[PDB]
Design an enzyme around this catalytic site. Structure first.
Site, PDB file in Angstrom:
ATOM      1  N   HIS A   8      -3.949  70.799  43.202  1.00 22.15           N
ATOM      2  CA  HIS A   8      -5.373  71.143  43.151  1.00 22.15           C
ATOM      3  C   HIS A   8      -5.861  71.872  44.080  1.00 22.15           C
ATOM      4  N   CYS A  36     -12.548  62.510  40.204  1.00 25.44           N
ATOM      5  CA  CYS A  36     -11.354  62.943  39.306  1.00 25.44           C
ATOM      6  C   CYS A  36     -12.381  62.861  37.789  1.00 25.44           C
ATOM      7  N   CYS A  71      -2.463  55.163  38.265  1.00 28.07           N
ATOM      8  CA  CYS A  71      -1.254  55.924  37.834  1.00 28.07           C
ATOM      9  C   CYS A  71      -1.099  57.233  38.445  1.00 28.07           C
ATOM     10  N   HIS A  72      -2.023  57.824  38.889  1.00 29.52           N
ATOM     11  CA  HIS A  72      -2.097  59.207  39.338  1.00 29.52           C
ATOM     12  C   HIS A  72      -2.524  59.089  40.913  1.00 29.52           C
ATOM     13  N   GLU A 156      -8.527  41.875  44.393  1.00 27.36           N
ATOM     14  CA  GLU A 156      -7.356  41.999  43.471  1.00 27.36           C
ATOM     15  C   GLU A 156      -6.288  42.954  44.091  1.00 27.36           C
ATOM     16  N   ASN A 164      -2.461  38.417  34.150  1.00 28.76           N
ATOM     17  CA  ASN A 164      -1.814  37.915  33.034  1.00 28.76           C
ATOM     18  C   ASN A 164      -2.896  37.401  31.796  1.00 28.76           C
ATOM     19  N   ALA A 169      -2.891  36.181  23.965  1.00 31.55           N
ATOM     20  CA  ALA A 169      -3.119  36.477  22.497  1.00 31.55           C
ATOM     21  C   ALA A 169      -3.917  35.590  21.517  1.00 31.55           C
ATOM     22  N   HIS A 365       8.379  31.364  26.716  1.00 30.70           N
ATOM     23  CA  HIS A 365       7.784  31.443  25.440  1.00 30.70           C
ATOM     24  C   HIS A 365       8.830  31.822  24.516  1.00 30.70           C
ATOM     25  N   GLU A 378       2.393  33.265  19.290  1.00 32.35           N
ATOM     26  CA  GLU A 378       2.896  31.816  18.552  1.00 32.35           C
ATOM     27  C   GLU A 378       1.746  31.966  17.322  1.00 32.35           C
ATOM     28  N   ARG A 381       3.505  32.386  14.049  1.00 35.87           N
ATOM     29  CA  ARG A 381       3.675  31.390  13.374  1.00 35.87           C
ATOM     30  C   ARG A 381       2.738  30.353  12.967  1.00 35.87           C
ATOM     31  N   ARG A 402       7.041  24.199  22.960  1.00 38.98           N
ATOM     32  CA  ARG A 402       7.698  25.564  23.202  1.00 38.98           C
ATOM     33  C   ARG A 402       9.167  25.537  23.880  1.00 38.98           C
ATOM     34  N   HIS A 504       7.471  32.736  31.002  1.00 43.97           N
ATOM     35  CA  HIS A 504       6.147  33.346  30.550  1.00 43.97           C
ATOM     36  C   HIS A 504       5.228  32.382  31.242  1.00 43.97           C
ATOM     37  N   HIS A 505       5.600  31.310  31.971  1.00 40.34           N
ATOM     38  CA  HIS A 505       4.266  30.625  32.509  1.00 40.34           C
ATOM     39  C   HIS A 505       4.992  29.450  33.484  1.00 40.34           C
ATOM     40  N   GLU A 534      -3.570  29.112  36.673  1.00 41.17           N
ATOM     41  CA  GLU A 534      -1.914  29.066  36.756  1.00 41.17           C
ATOM     42  C   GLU A 534      -1.310  28.898  38.140  1.00 41.17           C
ATOM     43  N   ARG A 544       3.737  23.216  28.877  1.00 36.29           N
ATOM     44  CA  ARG A 544       2.351  23.637  28.356  1.00 36.29           C
ATOM     45  C   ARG A 544       1.931  24.011  26.926  1.00 36.29           C
TER      46      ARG A 544
HETATM   47  C1  LIG Z   1       1.539  38.217  27.309  1.00 35.15           C
HETATM   48  C2  LIG Z   1       0.917  36.908  27.400  1.00 35.15           C
HETATM   49  C3  LIG Z   1       0.120  36.281  26.450  1.00 35.15           C
HETATM   50  C4  LIG Z   1      -0.415  35.076  26.892  1.00 35.15           C
HETATM   51  N1  LIG Z   1      -1.327  34.507  26.032  1.00 35.15           N
HETATM   52  C5  LIG Z   1      -1.961  33.313  25.988  1.00 35.15           C
HETATM   53  C6  LIG Z   1      -2.806  32.643  25.192  1.00 35.15           C
HETATM   54  O1  LIG Z   1      -3.388  33.325  24.181  1.00 35.15           O
HETATM   55  N2  LIG Z   1      -3.511  31.435  25.309  1.00 35.15           N
HETATM   56  C7  LIG Z   1      -3.307  30.892  26.616  1.00 35.15           C
HETATM   57  O2  LIG Z   1      -4.040  29.878  26.808  1.00 35.15           O
HETATM   58  N3  LIG Z   1      -2.408  31.339  27.664  1.00 35.15           N
HETATM   59  C8  LIG Z   1      -1.732  32.557  27.180  1.00 35.15           C
HETATM   60  N4  LIG Z   1      -1.053  33.210  28.340  1.00 35.15           N
HETATM   61  C9  LIG Z   1      -1.189  32.403  29.553  1.00 35.15           C
HETATM   62  C10 LIG Z   1      -2.143  32.953  30.530  1.00 35.15           C
HETATM   63  O3  LIG Z   1      -2.801  34.095  30.059  1.00 35.15           O
HETATM   64  C11 LIG Z   1      -2.069  32.866  31.997  1.00 35.15           C
HETATM   65  O4  LIG Z   1      -1.801  31.454  32.139  1.00 35.15           O
HETATM   66  C12 LIG Z   1      -3.392  33.373  32.721  1.00 35.15           C
HETATM   67  O5  LIG Z   1      -3.385  34.646  32.697  1.00 35.15           O
HETATM   68  C13 LIG Z   1      -3.516  32.441  33.933  1.00 35.15           C
HETATM   69  O6  LIG Z   1      -4.709  33.104  34.564  1.00 35.15           O
HETATM   70  P1  LIG Z   1      -5.185  33.345  35.766  1.00 35.15           P
HETATM   71  O7  LIG Z   1      -6.472  33.632  35.996  1.00 35.15           O
HETATM   72  O8  LIG Z   1      -4.810  31.825  36.637  1.00 35.15           O
HETATM   73  O9  LIG Z   1      -3.950  34.016  36.722  1.00 35.15           O
HETATM   74  P2  LIG Z   1      -3.683  35.732  36.016  1.00 35.15           P
HETATM   75  O10 LIG Z   1      -4.520  36.173  35.132  1.00 35.15           O
HETATM   76  O11 LIG Z   1      -2.577  36.025  36.381  1.00 35.15           O
HETATM   77  O12 LIG Z   1      -4.552  36.461  37.303  1.00 35.15           O
HETATM   78  C14 LIG Z   1      -4.052  36.440  38.570  1.00 35.15           C
HETATM   79  C15 LIG Z   1      -4.459  37.667  39.466  1.00 35.15           C
HETATM   80  O13 LIG Z   1      -4.221  37.559  40.965  1.00 35.15           O
HETATM   81  C16 LIG Z   1      -3.451  38.607  41.301  1.00 35.15           C
HETATM   82  N5  LIG Z   1      -3.119  38.230  42.778  1.00 35.15           N
HETATM   83  C17 LIG Z   1      -1.788  37.519  43.029  1.00 35.15           C
HETATM   84  N6  LIG Z   1      -1.773  37.254  44.327  1.00 35.15           N
HETATM   85  C18 LIG Z   1      -2.812  37.926  45.106  1.00 35.15           C
HETATM   86  C19 LIG Z   1      -3.183  38.085  46.296  1.00 35.15           C
HETATM   87  N7  LIG Z   1      -2.284  37.471  47.354  1.00 35.15           N
HETATM   88  N8  LIG Z   1      -4.128  38.839  46.476  1.00 35.15           N
HETATM   89  C20 LIG Z   1      -4.769  39.230  45.612  1.00 35.15           C
HETATM   90  N9  LIG Z   1      -4.382  39.138  44.368  1.00 35.15           N
HETATM   91  C21 LIG Z   1      -3.695  38.244  44.193  1.00 35.15           C
HETATM   92  C22 LIG Z   1      -2.695  39.084  40.479  1.00 35.15           C
HETATM   93  O14 LIG Z   1      -2.224  40.423  40.537  1.00 35.15           O
HETATM   94  C23 LIG Z   1      -3.505  38.637  39.082  1.00 35.15           C
HETATM   95  O15 LIG Z   1      -4.263  39.992  38.823  1.00 35.15           O
HETATM   96  C24 LIG Z   1      -0.388  34.355  28.332  1.00 35.15           C
HETATM   97  C25 LIG Z   1       0.500  34.912  29.095  1.00 35.15           C
HETATM   98  C26 LIG Z   1       0.951  36.261  28.843  1.00 35.15           C
HETATM   99  C27 LIG Z   1       1.657  36.696  30.107  1.00 35.15           C
HETATM  100  C1  HEC Z   2      -8.603  62.841  41.032  1.00 36.58           C
HETATM  101  C2  HEC Z   2      -7.618  62.174  42.062  1.00 36.58           C
HETATM  102  C3  HEC Z   2      -8.006  63.730  40.000  1.00 36.58           C
HETATM  103  C4  HEC Z   2      -7.160  63.303  39.070  1.00 36.58           C
HETATM  104  C5  HEC Z   2      -6.470  61.959  38.734  1.00 36.58           C
HETATM  105  C6  HEC Z   2      -6.831  64.600  38.248  1.00 36.58           C
HETATM  106  N1  HEC Z   2      -7.466  65.646  38.876  1.00 36.58           N
HETATM  107 FE1  HEC Z   2      -7.463  67.596  38.161  1.00 36.58          FE
HETATM  108  N2  HEC Z   2      -7.710  69.381  37.684  1.00 36.58           N
HETATM  109  C7  HEC Z   2      -8.761  70.230  37.727  1.00 36.58           C
HETATM  110  C8  HEC Z   2      -8.436  71.354  36.969  1.00 36.58           C
HETATM  111  C9  HEC Z   2      -9.336  72.684  36.955  1.00 36.58           C
HETATM  112  C10 HEC Z   2      -7.004  71.170  36.583  1.00 36.58           C
HETATM  113  C11 HEC Z   2      -6.262  72.351  35.851  1.00 36.58           C
HETATM  114  C12 HEC Z   2      -6.379  72.049  34.417  1.00 36.58           C
HETATM  115  C13 HEC Z   2      -7.600  72.129  33.744  1.00 36.58           C
HETATM  116  O1  HEC Z   2      -8.030  73.239  33.309  1.00 36.58           O
HETATM  117  O2  HEC Z   2      -8.209  71.309  33.496  1.00 36.58           O
HETATM  118  C14 HEC Z   2      -6.514  69.908  36.827  1.00 36.58           C
HETATM  119  C15 HEC Z   2      -5.350  69.276  36.557  1.00 36.58           C
HETATM  120  C16 HEC Z   2      -5.043  68.038  36.653  1.00 36.58           C
HETATM  121  C17 HEC Z   2      -3.955  67.546  36.333  1.00 36.58           C
HETATM  122  C18 HEC Z   2      -2.721  68.180  35.797  1.00 36.58           C
HETATM  123  C19 HEC Z   2      -1.807  68.868  36.833  1.00 36.58           C
HETATM  124  C20 HEC Z   2      -0.596  69.595  36.509  1.00 36.58           C
HETATM  125  O3  HEC Z   2       0.454  69.711  37.091  1.00 36.58           O
HETATM  126  O4  HEC Z   2      -0.543  70.383  35.295  1.00 36.58           O
HETATM  127  C21 HEC Z   2      -4.065  66.347  36.500  1.00 36.58           C
HETATM  128  C22 HEC Z   2      -2.799  65.042  36.092  1.00 36.58           C
HETATM  129  C23 HEC Z   2      -5.138  65.839  36.825  1.00 36.58           C
HETATM  130  N3  HEC Z   2      -5.942  67.090  37.296  1.00 36.58           N
HETATM  131  C24 HEC Z   2      -5.768  64.659  37.317  1.00 36.58           C
HETATM  132  C25 HEC Z   2      -9.963  69.739  38.137  1.00 36.58           C
HETATM  133  C26 HEC Z   2     -10.436  68.747  38.951  1.00 36.58           C
HETATM  134  C27 HEC Z   2     -11.299  68.616  39.975  1.00 36.58           C
HETATM  135  C28 HEC Z   2     -12.522  69.483  39.990  1.00 36.58           C
HETATM  136  C29 HEC Z   2     -12.853  70.088  41.093  1.00 36.58           C
HETATM  137  C30 HEC Z   2     -11.097  67.288  40.848  1.00 36.58           C
HETATM  138  C31 HEC Z   2     -11.842  66.762  41.759  1.00 36.58           C
HETATM  139  C32 HEC Z   2      -9.860  66.921  40.097  1.00 36.58           C
HETATM  140  N4  HEC Z   2      -9.254  67.701  39.337  1.00 36.58           N
HETATM  141  C33 HEC Z   2      -9.263  65.881  40.486  1.00 36.58           C
HETATM  142  C34 HEC Z   2      -8.379  65.191  39.663  1.00 36.58           C
HETATM  143  O1  LIG Z   3       1.640  32.975  21.854  1.00 42.31           O
HETATM  144  C1  LIG Z   3       0.489  33.347  22.379  1.00 42.31           C
HETATM  145  O2  LIG Z   3      -0.493  33.874  21.887  1.00 42.31           O
HETATM  146  C2  LIG Z   3       0.478  32.819  23.705  1.00 42.31           C
HETATM  147  O3  LIG Z   3       1.466  33.191  24.715  1.00 42.31           O
HETATM  148  C3  LIG Z   3      -0.081  31.357  23.984  1.00 42.31           C
HETATM  149  C4  LIG Z   3      -0.326  30.781  25.227  1.00 42.31           C
HETATM  150  O4  LIG Z   3      -0.843  29.933  25.617  1.00 42.31           O
HETATM  151  O5  LIG Z   3       0.794  31.178  26.036  1.00 42.31           O
HETATM  152 NA    NA Z   4       0.948  26.419  37.506  1.00 44.42          NA
END
Ligand SMILES: Cc1cc2nc3c(=O)[nH]c(=O)nc-3n(C[C@H](O)[C@H](O)[C@H](O)COP(=O)(O)OP(=O)(O)OC[C@H]3O[C@@H](n4cnc5c(N)ncnc54)[C@H](O)[C@@H]3O)c2cc1C
Ligand code: HEC
Ligand SMILES: O=C([O-])[C@H](O)C=C([O-])O
Ligand code: NA
Ligand code: HEC
Ligand code: HEC
Ligand code: HEC
Length: 568
Positions: A8, A36, A71-72, A156, A164, A169, A365, A378, A381, A402, A504-505, A534, A544
């Site tokens: 940039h 951005c 991601c960036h 967070e 999770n 689902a 799971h 699940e 099923r 389970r 899973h859990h 959890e 569970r």
């Molecule tokens: C793919 C999948 C599908 C599921 N489907 C179901 C379903 O449909 N029904 C059901 O009953 N259950 C389901 N479960 C189980 C359920 O979603 C999880 O039990 C639930 O997410 C527990 O929620 P939570 O709020 O306790 O924790 P989470 O949702 O896991 O959130 C906890 C958060 O705290 C964060 N964290 C941890 N440590 C720290 C720290 N030190 N500081 C700051 N942040 C921290 C994490 O990064 C996380 O974002 C599923 C689980 C998965 C993985």
């Molecule tokens: C904030 C941190 C971001 C993020 C995540 C990205 N940008 Fe930019 N960007 C700008 C322009 C003119 C370009 C050239 C392409 C275009 O004409 O749109 C880009 C390019 C990118 C990329 C591609 C990089 C590569 O290697 O090709 C990516 C992934 C991207 N940006 C993400 C313009 C701007 C801004 C204007 C002043 C600002 C602010 C940002 N970008 C900041 C970010």
């Molecule tokens: O199978 C699901 O959708 C799921 O993963 C259900 C629970 O409770 O953990």
């Molecule tokens: Na637990």
């Protein structure tokens, strides 16, 4: 260029991304991401430019507003968050391979210098309650505490919300709801309690299960009042009746519930801080909570002064090393979990004096996709799919608990099995189209063709489905005693999904009472310290039920926020 900033700056100034003095705005990088977006558009607008037929880095199932810097990164190569569960063909500029290496709480003791400096400083904020974790329990606690008149900070550690919970689902269990009544379902909190205790091998704390069952309808009502759709009610394993609530058509409950919670938190102007990890609960000279030391990824260590801390940090099912020490039978298994579900929140709880319980009880799971490495609900099923082995035969009651289902699948040839279903099942459960989109649900117009495609005995498969359909028609499964036979597998084409158990859990965790208060080994309350979701132990016992975790996190998160606010 070797990094995104370098790219940039070729034709932009530092202040194109940065504030005037150059300091980072906060650990959420609010100001910087806004820049951005000012040039590139919102995430949805970017997504228009990065479409693939079946996936999009910028349009995913993640709820909330996902920050670009998730991601960036600017000054170093960075990782695609999606790579923590999937392997899509991406070409992100300045990418590096996904690798999670997060220091343990114990390892952070090495920051003795920096931590002592922080604690020697004024508290960065002074509030009523700090909630740690942005899953369903944490957002519920933050909203409930705020509605009870408390000033909250929600933190967070990950770059994205939802833990999770956003992945959930199959549904949220509750009885006896308006939603069930509308669908001509008869249930009761008592029957949910009974199913739960039985399902957990009677290991569950009955006082906690009574909160789970008795508060369940209220929690569905509370979510619904906030805007959630919980009107579809499906069957999950080990349940006497359909009680797993989810959005219309059987779409995913988790992303939806988390989105609703996020929107409600934003509405209330709740202070949510990403990339902010809770490290150490601080206690005063009488052992009551006085605040918490946190570590901001970008701004460093600081502390918040508060009367109460609510740990809502989720489980440890991603951490296979910790899992395998507790249950060696799960060593080397794949996980369904988000990359940060490693149990650091438990370490925080123990360091604060909290006792753990039931840690040895860890759920696999039964059905992770072998091909995709993600959970297959699940509800596939529950809505009528069967399981077959490579020999093309049924081998288990597909809606049992389970523990039993996982063991049965692992006993089969190749230690995997196949979900088998037709288009009537597919149409009944909106979530199934997601597996088709992922490419993990091969299909054919006959079971012989599908069997040959997938390495299942085709004639045996054909005869198996015919026999099963016969049992559906007569209304009794004399082969495996499956108690609910909702659909014949006989409309349209057939699908197979290769499945095997994944970790899973974690049913164990911090010991709480019925007010979500954390207790020590002497069963003494630690004043000001709460646990919900959890992260806790005692609610689910040795196994569970599917649907009971979302029920738990809303009930106990809400209760914890109210109790913390009252405590003050
Ligand atoms: C793919 C999948 C599908 C599921 N489907 C179901 C379903 O449909 N029904 C059901 O009953 N259950 C389901 N479960 C189980 C359920 O979603 C999880 O039990 C639930 O997410 C527990 O929620 P939570 O709020 O306790 O924790 P989470 O949702 O896991 O959130 C906890 C958060 O705290 C964060 N964290 C941890 N440590 C720290 C720290 N030190 N500081 C700051 N942040 C921290 C994490 O990064 C996380 O974002 C599923 C689980 C998965 C993985
Ligand atoms: C904030 C941190 C971001 C993020 C995540 C990205 N940008 Fe930019 N960007 C700008 C322009 C003119 C370009 C050239 C392409 C275009 O004409 O749109 C880009 C390019 C990118 C990329 C591609 C990089 C590569 O290697 O090709 C990516 C992934 C991207 N940006 C993400 C313009 C701007 C801004 C204007 C002043 C600002 C602010 C940002 N970008 C900041 C970010
Ligand atoms: O199978 C699901 O959708 C799921 O993963 C259900 C629970 O409770 O953990
Ligand atoms: Na637990
Ligand atoms: C957007 C594309 C940026 C441009 C152009 C510049 N910076 Fe940056 N910077 C940006 C982000 C999102 C971050 C957070 C970390 C990351 O790499 O993603 C940073 C960080 C810094 C820092 C570190 C500050 C700290 O740790 O407290 C410094 C010192 C910094 N940036 C300086 C800097 C200068 C001098 C720039 C012009 C040459 C510049 N940055 C460009 C985003 C972007
Ligand atoms: C991880 C989940 C990401 C988030 C959050 C954001 N981006 Fe992204 N970005 C990501 C990937 C994996 C890719 C490559 C996509 C592919 O299909 O191979 C990208 C790409 C971009 C690009 C380049 C697009 C192009 O025309 O070639 C841009 C300009 C970009 N991303 C910007 C961007 C912004 C502004 C974001 C916040 C709104 C953002 N990305 C989020 C991964 C992820
Ligand atoms: C594990 C914690 C995951 C991460 C990280 C991401 N996804 Fe995901 N994804 C996960 C599961 C369990 C499933 C099964 C279907 C379901 O909705 O439960 C999926 C599915 C997908 C799919 C196919 C279905 C669809 O939504 O179209 C896609 C295209 C997908 N996931 C994309 C995706 C992206 C872009 C991600 C990063 C932002 C991402 N996933 C992260 C589990 C996990």
């Amino acid at each position: 260029a070797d990094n995104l900033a370098e790219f940039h700056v070729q034709n932009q100034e530092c202040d194109s991304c940065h504030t005037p003095d150059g300091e980072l705005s906060n650990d959420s990088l609010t100001y910087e991401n806004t820049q951005c977006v000012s040039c590139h558009g919102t995430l949805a607008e970017v997504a228009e430019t990065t479409k693939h037929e079946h996936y999009n880095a910028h349009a995913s199932h993640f709820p909330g507003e996902v920050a670009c810097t998730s991601c960036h990164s600017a000054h170093e190569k960075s990782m695609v968050y999606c790579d923590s569960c999937h392997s899509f063909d991406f070409n992100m500029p300045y990418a590096k391979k996904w690798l999670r290496d997060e220091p343990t709480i114990a390892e952070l003791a090495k920051d003795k210098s920096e931590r002592q400096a922080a604690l020697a400083s004024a508290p960065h904020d002074t509030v009523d309650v700090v909630v740690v974790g942005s899953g369903g329990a944490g957002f519920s606690a933050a909203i409930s505490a705020t509605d009870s008149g408390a000033k909250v900070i929600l933190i967070e550690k990950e770059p994205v919300i939802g833990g999770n919970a956003k992945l959930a689902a199959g549904g949220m269990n509750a009885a006896w709801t308006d939603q069930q009544k509308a669908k001509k379902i008869t249930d009761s909190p008592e029957l949910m309690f009974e199913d739960t205790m039985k399902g957990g091998q009677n290991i569950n704390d009955p006082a906690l299960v009574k909160v789970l069952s008795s508060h369940s309808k209220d929690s569905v009502d509370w979510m619904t009042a906030m805007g959630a759709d919980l009107t579809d009610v499906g069957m999950m394993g080990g349940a006497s009746v359909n009680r797993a609530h989810r959005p219309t058509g059987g779409c995913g409950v988790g992303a939806h519930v988390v989105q609703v919670l996020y929107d409600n938190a934003v509405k209330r102007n709740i202070d949510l801080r990403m990339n902010t990890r809770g490290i150490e609960v601080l206690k005063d000279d009488k052992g009551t909570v006085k605040g918490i030391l946190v570590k901001g990824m970008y701004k460093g260590y600081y502390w918040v002064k508060a009367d109460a801390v609510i740990l809502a940090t989720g489980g440890f099912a991603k951490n296979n090393e910790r899992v395998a020490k507790l249950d060696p039978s799960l060593k080397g298994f794949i996980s369904t979990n988000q990359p940060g579900a490693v149990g650091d929140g438990l370490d925080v709880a123990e360091n604060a004096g909290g006792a753990l319980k039931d840690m040895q009880y860890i759920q696999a799971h039964p059905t992770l996709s072998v091909k995709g490495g993600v959970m297959v609900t699940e509800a596939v099923r529950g809505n009528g799919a069967i399981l077959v082995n490579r020999e093309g035969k049924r081998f288990v009651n597909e809606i049992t608990t389970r523990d039993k289902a996982s063991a049965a699948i692992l006993a089969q040839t190749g230690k995997s099995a196949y979900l088998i279903f037709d288009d009537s099942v597919r149409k009944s459960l909106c979530k199934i189209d997601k597996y088709i989109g992922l490419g993990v649900a091969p299909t054919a117009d006959s079971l012989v063709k599908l069997g040959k495609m997938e390495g299942i005995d085709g004639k045996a498969l054909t005869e198996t489905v015919a026999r099963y359909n016969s049992l559906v028609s007569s209304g009794k499964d004399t082969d495996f005693e499956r108690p609910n036979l909702p659909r014949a597998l006989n409309e349209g084409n057939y699908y197979a999904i290769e499945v095997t158990p994944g970790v899973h859990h974690t049913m164990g965790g911090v010991m709480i009472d019925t007010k979500a208060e954390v207790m020590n080994a002497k069963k003494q309350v630690i004043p000001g310290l709460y646990g919900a979701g959890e992260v806790t132990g005692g609610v689910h016992g040795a196994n569970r039920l599917g649907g009971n975790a979302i029920s738990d996190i809303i009930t106990f998160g809400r209760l914890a926020g109210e109790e913390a606010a009252k405590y003050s």
